Amino acid sequence: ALDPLSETKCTLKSFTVEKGIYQTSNFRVQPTESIVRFPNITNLCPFGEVFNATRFASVYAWNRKRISNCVADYSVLYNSASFSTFKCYGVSPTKLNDLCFTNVYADSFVIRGDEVRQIAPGQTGKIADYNYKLPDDFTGCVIAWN
Amino acid sequence: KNKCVNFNFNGLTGTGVLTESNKKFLPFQQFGRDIADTTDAVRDPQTL
Amino acid sequence: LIANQFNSAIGKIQDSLSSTASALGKLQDVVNQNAQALNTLVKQLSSNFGAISSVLNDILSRLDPPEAEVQIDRLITGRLQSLQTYVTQQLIRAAEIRASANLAATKMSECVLGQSKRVDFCGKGYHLMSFPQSAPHGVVFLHVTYVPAQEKNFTTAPAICHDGKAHFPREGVFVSNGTHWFVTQRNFYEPQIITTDNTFVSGNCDVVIGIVNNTVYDPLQPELDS
Amino acid sequence: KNKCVNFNFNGLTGTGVLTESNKKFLPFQQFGRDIADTTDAVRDPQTLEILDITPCSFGGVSVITPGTNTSNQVAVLYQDVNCTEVNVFQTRAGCLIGAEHVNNSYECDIPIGAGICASYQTSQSIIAYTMSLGAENSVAYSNNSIAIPTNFTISVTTEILPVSMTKTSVDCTMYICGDSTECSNLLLQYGSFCTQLNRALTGIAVEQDK
Amino acid sequence: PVSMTKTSVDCTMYICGDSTECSNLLLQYGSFCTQLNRALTGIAVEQDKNTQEVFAQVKQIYKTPPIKDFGGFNFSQILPDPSKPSKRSFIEDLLFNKVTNGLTVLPPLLTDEMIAQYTSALLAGTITSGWTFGAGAALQIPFAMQMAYRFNGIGVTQNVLYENQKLIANQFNSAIGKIQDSLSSTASALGKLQDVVNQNAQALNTLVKQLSSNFGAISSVLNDILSRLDPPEAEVQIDRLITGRLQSLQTYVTQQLIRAAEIRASANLAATKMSECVLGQSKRVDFCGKGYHLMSFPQSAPHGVVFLHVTY
Ligand SMILES: *[C@@H]1O[C@H](CO)[C@@H](O[C@@H]2O[C@H](CO)[C@@H](O)[C@H](O)[C@H]2NC(C)=O)[C@H](O)[C@H]1NC(C)=O
Ligand SMILES: *[C@@H]1O[C@H](CO)[C@@H](O[C@@H]2O[C@H](CO)[C@@H](O)[C@H](O)[C@H]2NC(C)=O)[C@H](O)[C@H]1NC(C)=O
Ligand SMILES: *[C@@H]1O[C@H](CO)[C@@H](O[C@@H]2O[C@H](CO)[C@@H](O)[C@H](O)[C@H]2NC(C)=O)[C@H](O)[C@H]1NC(C)=O
Ligand SMILES: *[C@@H]1O[C@H](CO)[C@@H](O[C@@H]2O[C@H](CO)[C@@H](O)[C@H](O)[C@H]2NC(C)=O)[C@H](O)[C@H]1NC(C)=O
Ligand SMILES: *[C@@H]1O[C@H](CO)[C@@H](O[C@@H]2O[C@H](CO)[C@@H](O)[C@H](O)[C@H]2NC(C)=O)[C@H](O)[C@H]1NC(C)=O
Ligand SMILES: *[C@@H]1O[C@H](CO)[C@@H](O)[C@H](O)[C@H]1NC(C)=O
Ligand SMILES: *[C@@H]1O[C@H](CO)[C@@H](O)[C@H](O)[C@H]1NC(C)=O
Ligand SMILES: *[C@@H]1O[C@H](CO)[C@@H](O)[C@H](O)[C@H]1NC(C)=O
Ligand SMILES: *[C@@H]1O[C@H](CO)[C@@H](O)[C@H](O)[C@H]1NC(C)=O
Ligand SMILES: *[C@@H]1O[C@H](CO)[C@@H](O)[C@H](O)[C@H]1NC(C)=O
Ligand SMILES: *[C@@H]1O[C@H](CO)[C@@H](O)[C@H](O)[C@H]1NC(C)=O
Ligand SMILES: *[C@@H]1O[C@H](CO)[C@@H](O)[C@H](O)[C@H]1NC(C)=O
């Protein structure tokens, strides 16, 4: 990296470069600034309404809440110590704060401990088959607590 | 504008030079694409 | 007449090329092929190859290293395979183009810089000359060729008999319009009186098949008599 | 039998047409095979009769058309099938639909296969025909007759030849891992592929100049 | 060799034969299927072009006259035999008799009967008109006088031919008889063609056999996997099978591309020989048989051409 002749020597793996023109590196301009633009919303998503609901629905008649037109601070969820299972597919929890989505569906229900494993992509069993099925290409998070 | 920048519009990330465009986007059209199915033009989320 | 025919022919080339584009198919084809191979290559970027997305920044911005690694490995495999395909196709196509270019060089040497005696190598005809003309990603040869046009039947014979000797033509053929025999060059009807300057003698008349009788004129005898 | 069916015999599945065979299995042999390890015959487990498996008829479907600049009327070729499975004409190439069969032979316009070409001709329609190799001619050969030209012509013919291609280059790194470090670091695990592809393309471009 | 077998392969049916899960996975690979089809179609069109370039070198279809007075030369063994169903000559019959899952074989655009007609036309032209039918209008000339020209073409005076006509004709007839004997006796003569055939045969056997492979999947059969595993795992197994079979198809297509390049080179050479050798008299040494070239006679053959080079 000292000088272009040295880049050439390193590319050819030799000390004795013969006359010619050699393609050595690739020039690429580096970005000067970081630009972040999001729509100017000030509205927390009503996650309390869903997680702090007094009574929940049965798995066969699982409730579905639509989330739209709001700012979702997912830290409030993934930094809480109240959840035993926080398993995110096709997304990493930390990254959620940095992402936008057209819609979010919060499907809430209650099951027993041993069936929690069935709420995951491509699972089998009573729940995954007859109650609530996730797609094989599911992109989201599953949160469960005792 | 007119600088090589690391931009993020609504999660759409990339690196490029942003310039005033002359494309006749329709009132509904959100961003545009090139023959290569790559993002070629955007609508600022804060400004139409 | 020859100059007029040549000018007319070049005019016809002008008209043909001005009118119909299809003439340059061999070139257009090449172009199209490479175009397709590139469109294909570029389109193969929009494919998932089993990953969660075909875009790399989306994966990088959505997953943690341990999982983005797997998704990017899928994409890398796919795109590297696509590049290898394109490069292999291009190597084979370049071999074909090299063959065409070697042929074009051989034509420019043997055809333009010379006069070729090889049949159909320098246009259908007897080759006279050829003129090169550049073109996008190729060359164009105008081959000027001599094509015999109006033909006549004649009775012929492989030799004749004068004094029990057999006369064969030196360069040409013996022909007959029905009454008199002549000898003419074989590519254009220019009959000449058969003489000893036009023929040579070999053996006698009892060997050749299809030999005929005629008189061979000796140019010396008139001069001696005069 | 004699229908395209999805069959399942004791272990094996497939799709084909089952027909009465004339094969002679040994009393213990269950299902027959081709040279290419392809199942060609079975034994029905309930009745000890042998069935040939013919794969369900398939093939390319080709569309014959003059230019849209000329006409919107087209013909269809179902390749290497019968006219049963689908103005219809059976040919060595397959089933041709929408083209008129003609006894007259012409120069080949649109090749179909096995000596059949098609074209758009006069009320105009598409026609198929056995293609004509050229005007048949006999030459007045005899042991004592020669034809000599008395005149001539100067022809100028055009011969076009491709010489060079487009000197394309691809940065394998930027193509695979566009402006990404994680991706590039993963790409490093594949060894010399990037360099080898660059080298091949550079070879091609230098060859083009040569 | 002039042409290959115009093979075509349906990538979809080859990889994912009549299977929806497999096909839906295959969609993720993009245009590989289309580009393989396109490459093979290129090859097949090239094959038709090869045959055209070699044999369709004559505008008119000449036929010989009923009288076979060719100054004592005998061409019965190479002119077409009217009695046979296919209008082929004795030697063409010998040559034709000396050669033996989504995959379709497209038929060639010219039938054996048309190839034989083209060769018959070339042969009749070369016999009745010499080299003039390559230049332009065919001009009759007695065959003996044609041979006198062909002798003048190699620096032997024409009297030699006329004075030794019976002897030369007898030598030529003897030589053609020897050709008959060689082809009836030894098959190895047609190796260059048989080889081609065998190669393509092998490339297809191989392709088909690659279906019986697992490529690291639980099974080589697709329905077994679909009927045995759950979707989340059947997808992985089918991806293994798809990768394997797609690689096998790419291998086969690449080999076919290279082999078609080889066949095209051979066909360009054959076309050059038919032009410079049949339609003319070549002065290039050893291009038209070992000797001083006198003339040459073409003869069709399975996927190729055969030249009888007459040399002094
Ligand atoms: C064959 O050619 C000869 C020579 O050209 C012709 O004989 C000449 O005929 C013209 C008139 O037609 C006379 O004026 C000359 O006196 C003749 N020349 C000689 C040397 O006798 C002959 O007529 C031609 N025959 C045919 C059938 O065309
Ligand atoms: C060509 O000319 C020679 C000489 O005039 C002919 O030979 C004569 O043939 C006749 C017929 O048999 C005999 O009567 C003579 O005795 C022969 N003369 C000599 C000197 O041998 C010959 O016949 C002529 N060709 C033709 C076809 O008539
Ligand atoms: C399977 O079962 C069927 C019926 O029990 C058998 O078919 C019978 O075969 C006998 C002997 O040829 C016939 O007389 C009967 O008419 C058949 N009955 C029917 C209903 O088809 C068959 O042979 C058995 N095969 C095996 C391998 O056990
Ligand atoms: C050779 O052919 C050329 C062209 O076919 C002839 O030239 C033509 O002559 C006729 C009548 O004299 C004219 O109507 C044309 O305009 C001429 N064409 C050209 C291009 O000049 C010529 O007459 C022929 N020569 C012989 C001896 O027949
Ligand atoms: C040209 O050669 C052929 C082949 O030798 C000759 O055909 C033979 O002719 C004899 C006599 O009629 C027959 O007995 C044979 O059966 C023929 N051979 C075959 C293989 O059929 C023919 O005679 C020769 N032509 C001439 C004019 O001599
Ligand atoms: C739900 O309730 C808990 C405890 O009452 C609280 O800590 C949490 O912030 C609530 N969730 C919201 C407000 O989204
Ligand atoms: C918010 O966005 C809207 C978009 O229509 C715009 O009119 C408004 O000026 C913005 N306000 C702020 C404070 O960004
Ligand atoms: C020569 O004569 C034959 C018949 O004798 C005839 O068919 C042919 O057309 C003639 N050729 C020319 C050039 O006149
Ligand atoms: C030429 O042919 C005729 C008619 O077949 C025949 O009578 C004559 O003997 C032959 N002559 C020669 C020299 O070939
Ligand atoms: C259709 O063909 C004619 C000649 O046959 C040509 O003049 C015309 O340009 C073509 N149409 C178009 C739209 O190019
Ligand atoms: C088409 O079908 C009929 C009856 O099924 C049959 O006789 C005929 O041979 C078939 N044609 C071909 C080319 O197989
Ligand atoms: C075409 O040929 C076939 C078979 O020879 C015959 O049945 C038919 O009548 C012919 N058609 C015409 C219009 O001559």
Author numbering:
A (entry chain B): 292 to 437
B (entry chain B): 535 to 582
C (entry chain A): 922 to 1147
D (entry chain A): 535 to 620, 641 to 676, 689 to 776
E (entry chain C): 728 to 827, 856 to 1067
What does the report in the manuscript say about this coordinate set?
To develop an understanding of the structural basis of nanobody binding affinity, we carried out the biophysical and structural characterization of a series of six nanobodies targeting the receptor binding domain (RBD) of SARS-CoV-2 spike protein, comprising a hit from screening a naïve nanobody library and five affinity-matured mutants derived from this parental binder; two of the mutants have been shown to be potently neutralize the virus. Recognition of the RBD by the nanobodies is dominated by CDR3 and CDR2, with CDR1 only making a few contacts. At the heart of the interaction of these nanobodies with the RBD is a salt bridge π–cation interaction involving R52 from CDR2 of the nanobody and E484 and F490 of the virus RBD. As a result of binding to this epitope, the nanobody directly competes with the binding of angiotensin-converting enzyme 2 (ACE2) and thus is neutralizing.
Single-sparticle cryo-EM confirmed that the parent H11 and variants H11-A10, H11-H6, and H11-B5 bound to the same one-up–two-down conformation of the spike that we observed for H11-H4 and H11-D4 (29). As previously noted, this arrangement results in additional contacts between one nanobody bound to the down-configured RBD and a neighboring up-configured RBD. It was proposed that nanobody binding drives the spike into a single arrangement, removing the all-down conformer and various other ones. The spike protein on its own is dynamic but the binding of the H11 class of nanobodies apparently “freezes out” this motion consistent with the increased entropic penalty for binding. As suspected, we found that the H11 variants reduced the dynamics of the nanobody-RBD complexes as the binding became stronger.
